[PDB]
Amino acid sequence: GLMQFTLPVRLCKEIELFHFDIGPFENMWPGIFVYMVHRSCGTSCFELEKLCRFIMSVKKNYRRVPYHNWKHAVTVAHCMYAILQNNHTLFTDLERKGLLIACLCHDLDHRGFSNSYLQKFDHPLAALYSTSTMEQHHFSQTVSILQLEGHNIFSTLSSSEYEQVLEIIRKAIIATDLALYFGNRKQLEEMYQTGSLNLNNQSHRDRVIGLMMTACDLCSVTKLWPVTKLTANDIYAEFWAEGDEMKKLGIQPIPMMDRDKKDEVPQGQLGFYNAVAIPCYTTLTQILPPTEPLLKACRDNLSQWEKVIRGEE
Ligand SMILES: O=C(Nc1ccnc(Cl)c1)c1ccc2cc(-c3ccccc3)nn2c1
Ligand SMILES: [Mg+2]
Numbered sequence: 001g002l003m004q005f006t007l008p009v010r011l012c013k014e015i016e017l018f019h020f021d022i023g024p025f026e027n028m029w030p031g032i033f034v035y036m037v038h039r040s041c042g043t044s045c046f047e048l049e050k051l052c053r054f055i056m057s058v059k060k061n062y063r064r065v066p067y068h069n070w071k072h073a074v075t076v077a078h079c080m081y082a083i084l085q086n087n088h089t090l091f092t093d094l095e096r097k098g099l100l101i102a103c104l105c106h107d108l109d110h111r112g113f114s115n116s117y118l119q120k121f122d123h124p125l126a127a128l129y130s131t132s133t134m135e136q137h138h139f140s141q142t143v144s145i146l147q148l149e150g151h152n153i154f155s156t157l158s159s160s161e162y163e164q165v166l167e168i169i170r171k172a173i174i175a176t177d178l179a180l181y182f183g184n185r186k187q188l189e190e191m192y193q194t195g196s197l198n199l200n201n202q203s204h205r206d207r208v209i210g211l212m213m214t215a216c217d218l219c220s221v222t223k224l225w226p227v228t229k230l231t232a233n234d235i236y237a238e239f240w241a242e243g244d245e246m247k248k249l250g251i252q253p254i255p256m257m258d259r260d261k262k263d264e265v266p267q268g269q270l271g272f273y274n275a276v277a278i279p280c281y282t283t284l285t286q287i288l289p290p291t292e293p294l295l296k297a298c299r300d301n302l303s304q305w306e307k308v309i310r311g312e313e
């Protein structure tokens with residue numbers, strides 16, 4: 001009850017900033033997450049023993065893949081922490097509880113393969129979940145872990161509050177399917193510009209939480225350049241392995257996943273910043289002005305990729 005988590009001075013200060021990197025010491029990431037739950041939600045939100053047991057079972061159910069790993073889970077949770085702390089009064093008690101957990105769990109048991117590869121492989125999961133295949137699995141794994149003995153961090157919630165938080169988590173995790181992002185952002189852009197956006201409309205809140213989830217999930221593009229550049233290596237390490245597996249199924253992969261086309265990576269990053277990242281943080285900044293630093297950092301990284309193409313690095 002009177003047991004706060006406290007980080008070293010540099011981490012205590014920089015964890016508040018959007019571009020914070022959680023560092024290479026894996027053993028500190030549980031502590032960093034609990035610290036973030038305590039400050040963004042409260043020391044009362046969760047039973048500490050149950051939370052710690054929940055966190056360590058979530059960690060165990062992330063795989064040793066180059067990018068879609070435990071470090072990604074905690075990184076995405078930190079971006080959500082920064083959004084919530086910069087938007088104090090906008091979010092309900094249940095939303096602050098659910099969204100940090102949603103981010104920690106959003107890629108549970110990821111194999112480093114796209115929905116697309118599962119469909120072409122004819123993976124069992126593609127027959128169980130026809131759309132948003134991996135994201136329905138991530139939600140299923142979250143519910144599984146919540147139902148383990150001593151792992152029910154929501155035990156103090158009423159039956160209707162429990163159903164509400166699990167619905168926040170389900171929608172937040174489904175929203176991380178980038179295929180759904182494009183339509184969600186277009187709808188949010190129209191609602192904001194025609195002035196019909198209403199944060200008391202539950203279907204509108206759902207859309208806004210969806211965009212927050214895309215923003216947190218893509219947040220590697222909002223780090224300082226050296227973090228962004230090195231994270232790109234891990235992202236493409238997965239993409240190229242999927243491309244290899246596409247070639248094993250006798251299917252030429254998209255260039256993004258073809259290691260023979262490494263040379264086109266800089267131009268591929270430009271397309272991604274212009275088609276996905278910048279539009280994402282732009283719309284997020286219009287709806288939630290204090291998230292502007294994410295847009296600024298994204299624009300800084302776009303400029304760095306433009307420099308790579310011009311041979312200035
Ligand atoms: O980074 C990307 N997607 C992503 C998804 C989820 N999360 C994160 Cl953080 C990032 C991304 C998107 C499109 C694209 C095209 C090419 C590309 C094109 C031609 C040649 C070589 C490569 N690379 N490439 C990378
Ligand atoms: Mg995912």
Ligand SMILES: [Zn+2]
Pocket residue numbers: 072076106107176217
């Ligand atoms: Zn993710």
